[PDB]
């Protein structure tokens, strides 16, 4: 099948290269990713200025291009300009560091796969859960095995899979729900050479979920976390309550 690979750490990232190589063993792989590493860009897209692409190679069996856009921009370009609107699977990763809880909202890795989900194409976001010491190969190999055991018809429309792989040894895998893991921000103030102060964003993690089947608890125990997510943010319970009171 025709597979599209992208990421948010840049086309030269080892995380995207190993992933492309392994997948190219049995499928037609196309790589379209940012020319340079992106930060917490969330689901940003480029509409106010033009986008540019550059054909670069990584090896045979794989056609690759780097772009001046975001991960979502990359998926839009690959689908319309490079793959003739014929894409069977989209994989965004392997990211350096975890993408769990509310942090998924500002994740470029997740954004790439979510763009695929909005187009109704089977998509997967995969991250190695250790920023300091990532294991790109381990995450990529897990993915190859998982694909042979997963029934994609079970993935509902506009739905993608957010996967986080433990950096150490993998005990197994679990289907999880997104946690409420978030951060308690704060800033450190400093002064520039001009006497003007600037601020550095900092923070401490908050893990207070009471449910046992959330993403970070699985990873903490050495299990791969697999969460099905979609682009629908309506709080149904709240909506029902509002309608009952204001009927």
Tell whether residue 154 is a contact of a copy of itself (CB under 8 A).
yes
Q: For residue 69, what are the contacts with CB-CB under 8 A and spacing of at least 6?
A: 34, 45, 46, 51, 77
Answer with the entry of Mg ion, a copy of itself, none that 95 interacts with (C-beta below 5 to 8 A by kind). Answer: Mg ion
> Residue 153, interface with a copy of itself (CB under 8 A)?
yes
Contact with a copy of itself (CB under 8 A) among 48, 55, 86, 197:
86
Instruction: Give the span between the Cα atoms of 105 and 162, in whole angstroms.
Output: 12
Nearer to a copy of itself, 22 or 119 (CB): 119
Consult the annotation and say whether 192 binds a ligand: no
Q: What's the CA gap between 93 and 188, in Å, rounded?
A: 32
Considering only residues 53 to 112 of the shown chain, the ones binding Mg ion according to CB under 5 A are: 95
Non-local CB neighbours of 107 within 8 Å, separated by 6+ positions: 8, 40, 42, 95, 99, 125
Confirm whether residue 153 is marked as ligand binding: no
Q: Which of residues 92-121 bind a copy of itself (CB under 8 A)?
A: 118-121
Size of the site for a copy of itself (CB under 8 A): 10
Half-sphere exposure of 152 (CA within 13 A, CB side): 13
- Residue 121 binds which entry of Mg ion, a copy of itself, none, with Cβ cut-offs from 5 to 8 Å by kind? a copy of itself
Distance between CA atoms of residues 219 and 180, nearest Å: 15
Span interacting with a copy of itself, options 47-55, 78-86, 130-138, 182-190, rule CB under 8 A: 78-86
130 is in an annotated binding site: no
Task: Establish whether the linkage from the previous residue to 62 is cis, with ω within 30° of 0.
Answer: no
- Told to check if 85 binds a copy of itself by CB under 8 A, we report yes
Name the helix (H) or strand (E) containing 140.
Answer: helix 136-147
In angstroms, give the least distance from the CB of 151 to a copy of itself: 8
Dihedral sign computed on CA atoms, order 73, 104, 39, 43? positive
Q: Does 1 bind a copy of itself (CB under 8 A)?
A: no
- Write out the residues near Mg ion by the rule CB under 5 A: 8-9, 39, 95
């Amino acid at each position: 099948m025709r597979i599209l690979v992208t990421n948010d750490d840049g086309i030269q990232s080892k995380g995207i290269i190993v992933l492309a190589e392994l997948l190219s063993e049995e499928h037609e792989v196309f790589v379209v990713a940012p020319d340079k590493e992106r930060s917490a860009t969330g689901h940003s897209i480029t509409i106010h200025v033009p986008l540019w692409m550059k054909k670069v190679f990584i090896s045979e069996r794989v056609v690759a291009y780097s772009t001046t856009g975001t991960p979502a921009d990359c998926v839009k370009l690959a689908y319309n300009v490079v793959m003739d609107k014929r894409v069977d699977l989209i994989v965004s990763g392997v990211n350096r560091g975890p993408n769990m809880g509310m942090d998924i909202l500002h994740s470029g890795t997740v954004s790439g796969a979510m763009e695929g989900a909005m187009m109704n194409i089977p998509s997967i976001a995969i991250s190695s859960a250790n920023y300091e010491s990532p294991d790109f190969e381990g995450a990529a190999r897990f993915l190859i095995d998982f694909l042979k055991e997963f029934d994609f018809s079970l993935l509902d429309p506009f739905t993608m899979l957010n996967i986080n792989v433990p950096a150490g040894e993998i005990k197994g895998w679990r289907f999880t729900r997104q946690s409420r893991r978030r951060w308690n921000d704060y800033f450190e103030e400093r002064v520039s050479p001009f006497g003007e102060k600037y601020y550095w964003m900092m923070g401490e993690v908050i893990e207070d979920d009471d449910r046992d089947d959330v993403d970070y608890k699985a990873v903490r125990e050495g299990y791969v976390s697999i969460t099905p997510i979609h682009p629908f943010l309506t709080n149904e319970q709240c909506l029902k309550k509002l309608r009952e009171v204001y009927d």
